[PDB]
């Protein structure tokens, strides 16, 4: 029937023109809401960085680890907690007292530690560079704090979990995030790729578009696809991760570069997270990176004019994440034992140098 | 025929475009729901972070409010208002750098079109903390006709800060009841004119009350409001002493909320209390050991709440009009000083 089709056409043109109206209306509403969301997120980002600055871009904590059951044969120093920020230690055979942003003790949990870290993940997603260090003498607890164990995972695994939850959430703001992951060791001022068997010469050079930024030539830089992929990469690197004189004396750096793209407004947001399990602080090139790292941190705090980031592999690698608006957290790991007393004091004296430098 | 064919084509295409546009209406509906929810979460987190910043800073808090022209005043000329961000506001005569400050940064600036609820949104955190033993003080400052009373009291159609505090107060309380805390609320209302105090129903002897329910307090609130060019020069104070009790442990929280709608700041011992407030702010900025809290009967009460910290919030109400310009600048330059006060 011609009339049935005709009257259906008329009906469908009505339907059509009214839907175009209910669509145009929705579209305008969606435009203004999106714009207010973007602005609101810039302001949220700003306030967040304000908090970070009010707490200090560079912060230092202490963490005294508990003895293991296999360590009862070892006597502990006498530890005294003057307050949340101040700890003192006494040789069991004149005062050694140290102030920190916060002191963590043997009962302090892995998540207690991560609470200091989680706000900075958001910072990384906001375009700020982050550095998280574990500092201290071999046996003090650097690796347990950074990697941890399956029953109690440390900073890195928790950082990954939070990174995926947050990147997921961001999709609703119109942002899409890449993660570039690189894993390396630094031993005797030479860089090693923890994702490769191959022997190669890796150099630290200026980034193509940012001369203040850096990149490592000939390194395996992975674009993360999903959590399974990143779990595989971390496992692999942990397997090749370091021999007493070399295990104790090699730095480990896990770098997660967050690259965020908002396609509609055509904006980017690049911020990286460097998670560093430092070489032991126990007393040429073997210790170059560590001493230069402490020099650089203190120099930044003293607002020193010129800073020789390139005096060592470590400081040069992390340079773009140390100066300026970058945030640093350093966990000074300490073992509670009398026979470590002298090294525990050396470690904690760096903290004191930091406090003295903050004014 | 050719007409059946042509009509067939027409309906097919129209069915396909109907299906498209309906598909697009669906995607848009979903994306809009998502976007609104995200705008809500982002705003909420923004408010939380802002409150955290104000605490860490521990300055006296300053919010600036520009009131909209009234239906009457629709033919009254306004000066030029520029807003550079959420906390920065500039005003220029409708008619220069050497002349001083025309650009003012505060904790928050409220547009003429700001709801009473938006105002309260950024004050409620301060009120909730009174329950934790702190002395709180919200006070409104500005020339007459700028919106002090409207901001604190409000009108029945859109209630102000003081009214909404009740809701927030009992609501927050009944969650402490869960914790095993017991709260009583002592209330007092008073007025100050020519350095003389009046009970509108430490300080003694003035009418007190122990509150039972929101209605009891809404009532006595109305009663005080009922008894108020002298209201233009009279200060209004409303204190709500919150006294919590736990028997395990034996601790008590004692914290209060003070709500002041000050006299007008316009250029006139008639307006002294106000002048001595100005002097106490000048003193706190000097951070000096002897401070003239006692040179007036308002600064005496606000002395407990003028230690110079983030537990004190000042609204700086301002009129949009050109004939109010000079008064508005004066009000703003003062508010700038207040925002710089941190002492105790
Ligand atoms: N906070 C802690 N709680 C429980 N065990 C810990 C803690 N810190 C370290 N350990 C244990 O003590 C040992 C030394 O830790 P490790 O990270 O190897 O020190 P480092 O890396 O500084 O040499 C590890 O076997 C680890 O399981
Ligand atoms: N934010 C506002 N929105 C709409 N009208 C307002 C607002 N603030 C004040 N008004 C109106 O303007 C007039 C002057 O306000 P008012 O609070 O009496 O000034 P003040 O108390 O500072 O002398 C009032 O009658 C009130 O109705
Ligand atoms: Mg280790």
From Swiss-Prot, chain A:
Its main location: cytoplasm. Its EC number is 3.6.4.-. Residues 351-355 are annotated as: Required for minus-end directionality. It catalyses: ATP + H2O = ADP + phosphate + H(+). It is found in: Cytoplasm, Cytoskeleton. One of its GO terms (biological process) is cell division. GO terms for molecular function: ATP binding; hydrolase activity; microtubule binding; minus-end-directed microtubule motor activity; protein homodimerization activity. The keyword Transferase does not apply. The keyword Hydrolase applies. It comes from the Eukaryota. Residues 57-357 form the Kinesin motor domain. One of its GO terms (cellular component) is nucleus. It is an enzyme of class 3 (hydrolase). Keywords: ATP-binding, Cell cycle, Cell division, Coiled coil, Cytoplasm, Cytoskeleton, Hydrolase, Meiosis, Microtubule, Mitosis, Motor protein, Nucleotide-binding, Phosphoprotein. ATP binds at residues 136-143. Minus-end-directed microtubule-based motor protein. Has ATPase activity. Required for normal chromosomal segregation in meiosis in females, and in early mitotic divisions of the embryo. Belongs to the TRAFAC class myosin-kinesin ATPase superfamily. Kinesin family. NCD subfamily. This is Protein claret segregational. The chain holds residues 293 to 672 of 700 of the full protein.
Curated annotation (Swiss-Prot), chain B:
The chain holds residues 293 to 673 of 700 of the full protein. Minus-end-directed microtubule-based motor protein. Has ATPase activity. Required for normal chromosomal segregation in meiosis in females, and in early mitotic divisions of the embryo. It comes from the Eukaryota. Residues 335-339 are annotated as: Required for minus-end directionality. Residues 59-341 form the Kinesin motor domain. Belongs to the TRAFAC class myosin-kinesin ATPase superfamily. Kinesin family. NCD subfamily. This is Protein claret segregational. ATP binds at residues 142-149. It is found in: Cytoplasm, Cytoskeleton.
């Amino acid at each position: 029937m011609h009339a049935a089709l005709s009257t259906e056409v008329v009906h469908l043109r009505q339907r059509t023109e009214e839907l175009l109206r209910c669509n145009e209306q929705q579209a305008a509403e969606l435009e203004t809401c999106k714009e207010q969301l973007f602005q609101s997120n810039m302001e949220r980002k700003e306030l967040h960085n304000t908090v970070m600055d009010l707490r200090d871009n560079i912060r230092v904590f202490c963490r005294i680890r508990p003895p293991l059951e296999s360590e009862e044969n070892r006597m502990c120093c006498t530890w005294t907690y003057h307050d949340e920020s101040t700890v003192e230690l006494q040789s069991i055979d004149g005062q050694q007292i140290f102030s920190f942003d916060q002191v963590f003790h043997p009962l302090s949990s892995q998540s207690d530690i991560f609470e200091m870290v989680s706000p900075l993940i958001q910072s990384a997603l906001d375009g700020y560079n982050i550095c998280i260090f574990a500092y201290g003498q071999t046996g003090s607890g650097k690796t347990y704090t950074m990697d941890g164990v399956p029953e109690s995972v440390g900073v890195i695994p928790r950082t990954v979990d939070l990174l995926f939850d947050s990147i997921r959430g961001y999709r609703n703001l119109g942002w899409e995030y890449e993660i570039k992951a690189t894993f390396l060791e630094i031993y005797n001022e030479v860089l090693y790729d923890l994702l490769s068997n191959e022997q190669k010469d890796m150099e630290i050079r200026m980034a193509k578009n940012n001369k203040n930024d850096i990149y490592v030539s000939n390194i395996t830089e992975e674009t993360v696809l999903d959590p399974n992929h990143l779990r595989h990469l971390m496992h692999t690197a942990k397997m090749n991760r370091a021999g007493n004189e070399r295990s104790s004396r090699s730095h480990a750096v896990t770098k997660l570069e967050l690259i965020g793209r908002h396609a509609e407004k055509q904006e980017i947001s690049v911020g990286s997270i460097n998670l560093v399990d430092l070489a032991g602080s126990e007393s040429k090139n073997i210790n170059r990176s560590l001493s230069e790292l402490t020099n650089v941190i203190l120099a930044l705090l003293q607002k020193q004019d010129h800073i020789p980031y390139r005096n060592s592999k470590l400081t040069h690698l992390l340079m773009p994440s140390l100066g300026g608006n970058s945030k640093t957290l350093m966990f000074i790991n300490v073992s509670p034992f009398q026979d470590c007393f002298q090294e525990s004091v050396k470690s904690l004296r760096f903290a004191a140098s930091v406090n003295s430098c903050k004014m």
